[PDB]
CSV table of all heavy atoms in Angstrom, one decimal:
chain,number,residue,atom,x,y,z
J,1,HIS,N,3.0,-12.2,5.4
J,1,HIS,CA,3.9,-12.7,6.4
J,1,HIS,C,4.9,-11.6,6.8
J,1,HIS,O,5.2,-10.7,6.1
J,1,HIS,CB,4.7,-14.0,6.0
J,1,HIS,CG,3.8,-15.1,5.7
J,1,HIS,ND1,3.2,-15.9,6.8
J,1,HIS,CD2,3.3,-15.7,4.6
J,1,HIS,CE1,2.5,-16.8,6.3
J,1,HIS,NE2,2.5,-16.8,5.0
J,2,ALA,N,5.5,-11.8,8.0
J,2,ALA,CA,6.3,-10.7,8.6
J,2,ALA,C,7.7,-10.7,7.9
J,2,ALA,O,8.5,-11.5,8.2
J,2,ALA,CB,6.5,-11.0,10.1
J,3,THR,N,7.8,-9.8,7.0
J,3,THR,CA,9.1,-9.6,6.3
J,3,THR,C,10.1,-8.9,7.3
J,3,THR,O,9.6,-8.3,8.3
J,3,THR,CB,8.8,-8.7,5.1
J,3,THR,OG1,7.7,-9.2,4.4
J,3,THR,CG2,10.0,-8.8,4.1
J,4,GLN,N,11.4,-9.0,7.0
J,4,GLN,CA,12.3,-8.2,7.7
J,4,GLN,C,12.2,-6.7,7.4
J,4,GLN,O,12.8,-5.8,8.1
J,4,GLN,CB,13.8,-8.6,7.5
J,4,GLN,CG,14.1,-10.0,8.2
J,4,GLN,CD,15.6,-10.3,8.0
J,4,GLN,OE1,16.3,-9.6,7.3
J,4,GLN,NE2,16.0,-11.4,8.6
J,5,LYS,N,11.7,-6.4,6.2
J,5,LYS,CA,11.5,-5.0,5.8
J,5,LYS,C,10.2,-4.3,6.3
J,5,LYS,O,10.2,-3.2,6.7
J,5,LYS,CB,11.6,-4.8,4.3
J,5,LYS,CG,11.4,-3.4,3.7
J,5,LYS,CD,12.4,-2.4,4.3
J,5,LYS,CE,13.8,-2.7,3.9
J,5,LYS,NZ,14.7,-1.6,4.5
J,6,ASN,N,9.1,-5.1,6.4
J,6,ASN,CA,7.9,-4.6,7.0
J,6,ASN,C,7.5,-5.7,8.0
J,6,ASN,O,7.2,-6.8,7.6
J,6,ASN,CB,6.8,-4.3,6.0
J,6,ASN,CG,5.7,-3.5,6.6
J,6,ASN,OD1,5.7,-3.2,7.8
J,6,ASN,ND2,4.7,-3.2,5.8
J,7,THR,N,7.3,-5.3,9.2
J,7,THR,CA,6.9,-6.2,10.3
J,7,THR,C,5.5,-6.6,10.3
J,7,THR,O,5.1,-7.6,10.9
J,7,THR,CB,7.4,-5.7,11.6
J,7,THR,OG1,6.9,-4.3,11.8
J,7,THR,CG2,8.9,-5.8,11.8
J,8,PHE,N,4.6,-5.8,9.6
J,8,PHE,CA,3.2,-6.2,9.5
J,8,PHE,C,2.8,-6.9,8.2
J,8,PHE,O,1.8,-7.5,8.2
J,8,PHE,CB,2.4,-4.9,9.5
J,8,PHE,CG,2.3,-4.1,10.7
J,8,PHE,CD1,3.1,-3.0,10.9
J,8,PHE,CD2,1.6,-4.6,11.8
J,8,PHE,CE1,3.0,-2.3,12.1
J,8,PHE,CE2,1.6,-3.9,13.0
J,8,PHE,CZ,2.3,-2.7,13.1
J,9,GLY,N,3.7,-7.0,7.2
J,9,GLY,CA,3.3,-7.5,5.9
J,9,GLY,C,2.9,-6.4,5.0
J,9,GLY,O,2.6,-5.3,5.4
J,10,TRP,N,2.8,-6.7,3.7
J,10,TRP,CA,2.5,-5.7,2.7
J,10,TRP,C,1.0,-5.7,2.5
J,10,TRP,O,0.5,-5.6,1.3
J,10,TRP,CB,3.2,-5.9,1.4
J,10,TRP,CG,4.7,-5.9,1.6
J,10,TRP,CD1,5.5,-6.9,1.8
J,10,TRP,CD2,5.5,-4.7,1.8
J,10,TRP,NE1,6.8,-6.5,2.0
J,10,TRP,CE2,6.8,-5.1,2.0
J,10,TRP,CE3,5.2,-3.3,1.8
J,10,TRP,CZ2,7.8,-4.2,2.2
J,10,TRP,CZ3,6.2,-2.4,1.9
J,10,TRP,CH2,7.5,-2.9,2.1
J,11,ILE,N,0.2,-5.6,3.5
J,11,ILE,CA,-1.3,-5.7,3.4
J,11,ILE,C,-1.9,-4.3,3.2
J,11,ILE,O,-3.1,-4.2,2.9
J,11,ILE,CB,-1.8,-6.5,4.6
J,11,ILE,CG1,-3.2,-7.0,4.3
J,11,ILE,CG2,-1.8,-5.6,5.8
J,11,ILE,CD1,-3.7,-8.0,5.3
J,12,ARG,N,-1.1,-3.2,3.4
J,12,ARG,CA,-1.5,-1.9,3.2
J,12,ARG,C,-1.1,-1.4,1.8
J,12,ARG,O,-1.2,-0.2,1.5
J,12,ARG,CB,-1.1,-1.0,4.3
J,12,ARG,CG,-1.7,0.4,4.4
J,12,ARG,CD,-1.4,1.3,5.6
J,12,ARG,NE,-2.3,1.0,6.7
J,12,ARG,CZ,-2.3,1.8,7.8
J,12,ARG,NH1,-1.5,2.8,7.9
J,12,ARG,NH2,-3.2,1.6,8.7
J,13,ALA,N,-0.6,-2.3,1.0
J,13,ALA,CA,-0.3,-1.9,-0.4
J,13,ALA,C,-1.5,-1.7,-1.2
J,13,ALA,O,-1.5,-0.7,-2.0
J,13,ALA,CB,0.6,-3.0,-1.1
J,14,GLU,N,-2.6,-2.4,-1.0
J,14,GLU,CA,-3.8,-2.3,-1.8
J,14,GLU,C,-4.8,-1.3,-1.1
J,14,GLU,O,-6.0,-1.3,-1.5
J,14,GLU,CB,-4.5,-3.6,-2.0
J,14,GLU,CG,-5.0,-4.3,-0.7
J,14,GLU,CD,-5.5,-5.6,-1.0
J,14,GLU,OE1,-5.4,-6.1,-2.1
J,14,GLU,OE2,-6.0,-6.3,0.0
J,15,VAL,N,-4.4,-0.6,-0.1
J,15,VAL,CA,-5.1,0.6,0.3
J,15,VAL,C,-4.7,1.8,-0.4
J,15,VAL,O,-5.5,2.7,-0.8
J,15,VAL,CB,-5.1,0.7,1.9
J,15,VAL,CG1,-5.8,2.0,2.3
J,15,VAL,CG2,-5.7,-0.5,2.5
J,16,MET,N,-3.4,2.0,-0.6
J,16,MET,CA,-2.9,3.1,-1.4
J,16,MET,C,-2.6,2.8,-2.9
J,16,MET,O,-2.1,3.6,-3.6
J,16,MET,CB,-1.6,3.7,-0.8
J,16,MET,CG,-0.4,2.9,-1.0
J,16,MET,SD,0.9,4.0,-0.5
J,16,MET,CE,0.8,5.2,-1.8
J,17,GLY,N,-3.0,1.6,-3.3
J,17,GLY,CA,-3.2,1.5,-4.7
J,17,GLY,C,-4.5,2.0,-5.2
J,17,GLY,O,-4.7,2.1,-6.4
J,18,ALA,N,-5.4,2.4,-4.3
J,18,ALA,CA,-6.6,3.1,-4.6
J,18,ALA,C,-6.6,4.6,-4.2
J,18,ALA,O,-7.5,5.3,-4.5
J,18,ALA,CB,-7.8,2.4,-3.8
J,19,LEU,N,-5.6,5.0,-3.5
J,19,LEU,CA,-5.4,6.4,-3.3
J,19,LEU,C,-4.7,7.0,-4.5
J,19,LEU,O,-5.0,8.2,-4.9
J,19,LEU,CB,-4.5,6.7,-2.1
J,19,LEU,CG,-4.2,8.2,-1.7
J,19,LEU,CD1,-5.5,8.8,-1.4
J,19,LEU,CD2,-3.2,8.3,-0.6
J,20,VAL,N,-3.9,6.3,-5.2
J,20,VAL,CA,-3.2,6.8,-6.4
J,20,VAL,C,-4.2,6.9,-7.6
J,20,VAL,O,-4.3,7.9,-8.3
J,20,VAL,CB,-2.0,5.9,-6.8
J,20,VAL,CG1,-1.5,6.3,-8.1
J,20,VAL,CG2,-1.0,6.0,-5.7
J,21,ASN,N,-5.1,5.9,-7.8
J,21,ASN,CA,-6.1,5.9,-8.8
J,21,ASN,C,-7.2,7.0,-8.6
J,21,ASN,O,-8.0,7.2,-9.5
J,21,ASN,CB,-6.7,4.6,-9.0
J,21,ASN,CG,-5.8,3.6,-9.7
J,21,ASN,OD1,-5.1,4.0,-10.6
J,21,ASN,ND2,-5.8,2.4,-9.3
J,22,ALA,N,-7.3,7.5,-7.4
J,22,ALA,CA,-8.3,8.5,-7.2
J,22,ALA,C,-7.7,9.9,-7.1
J,22,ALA,O,-8.3,10.9,-6.7
J,22,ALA,CB,-9.1,8.2,-5.9
J,23,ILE,N,-6.4,10.0,-7.4
J,23,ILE,CA,-5.7,11.3,-7.5
J,23,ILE,C,-5.2,11.4,-8.9
J,23,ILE,O,-5.1,12.5,-9.4
J,23,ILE,CB,-4.6,11.4,-6.4
J,23,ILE,CG1,-5.2,11.5,-5.0
J,23,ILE,CG2,-3.7,12.6,-6.6
J,23,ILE,CD1,-4.2,11.3,-3.9
J,24,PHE,N,-4.9,10.3,-9.5
J,24,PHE,CA,-4.6,10.3,-10.9
J,24,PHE,C,-5.9,10.5,-11.7
J,24,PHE,O,-5.9,11.0,-12.9
J,24,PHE,CB,-4.0,9.0,-11.3
J,24,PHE,CG,-3.7,8.9,-12.8
J,24,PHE,CD1,-2.9,9.7,-13.5
J,24,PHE,CD2,-4.3,7.8,-13.5
J,24,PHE,CE1,-2.7,9.6,-14.8
J,24,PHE,CE2,-4.1,7.7,-14.8
J,24,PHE,CZ,-3.3,8.6,-15.5
J,25,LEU,N,-7.1,10.3,-11.1
J,25,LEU,CA,-8.4,10.6,-11.7
J,25,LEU,C,-8.8,12.1,-11.5
J,25,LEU,O,-9.3,12.7,-12.4
J,25,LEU,CB,-9.5,9.7,-11.3
J,25,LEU,CG,-10.9,10.0,-11.8
J,25,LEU,CD1,-10.9,9.8,-13.2
J,25,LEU,CD2,-11.8,9.0,-11.1
J,26,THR,N,-8.5,12.6,-10.3
J,26,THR,CA,-8.9,14.0,-10.0
J,26,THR,C,-7.9,15.0,-10.7
J,26,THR,O,-8.3,16.1,-11.0
J,26,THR,CB,-8.9,14.2,-8.5
J,26,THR,OG1,-9.8,13.2,-7.9
J,26,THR,CG2,-9.6,15.5,-8.1
J,27,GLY,N,-6.7,14.5,-11.1
J,27,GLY,CA,-5.9,15.3,-11.9
J,27,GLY,C,-6.0,15.0,-13.3
J,27,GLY,O,-5.1,15.2,-14.1
């Protein structure tokens, strides 16, 4: 839902929860 902090919602949180695990793996 449209938070006052993010107008789109936090639905892009689980796109960069998989960018971190693929850079913590390559390092």
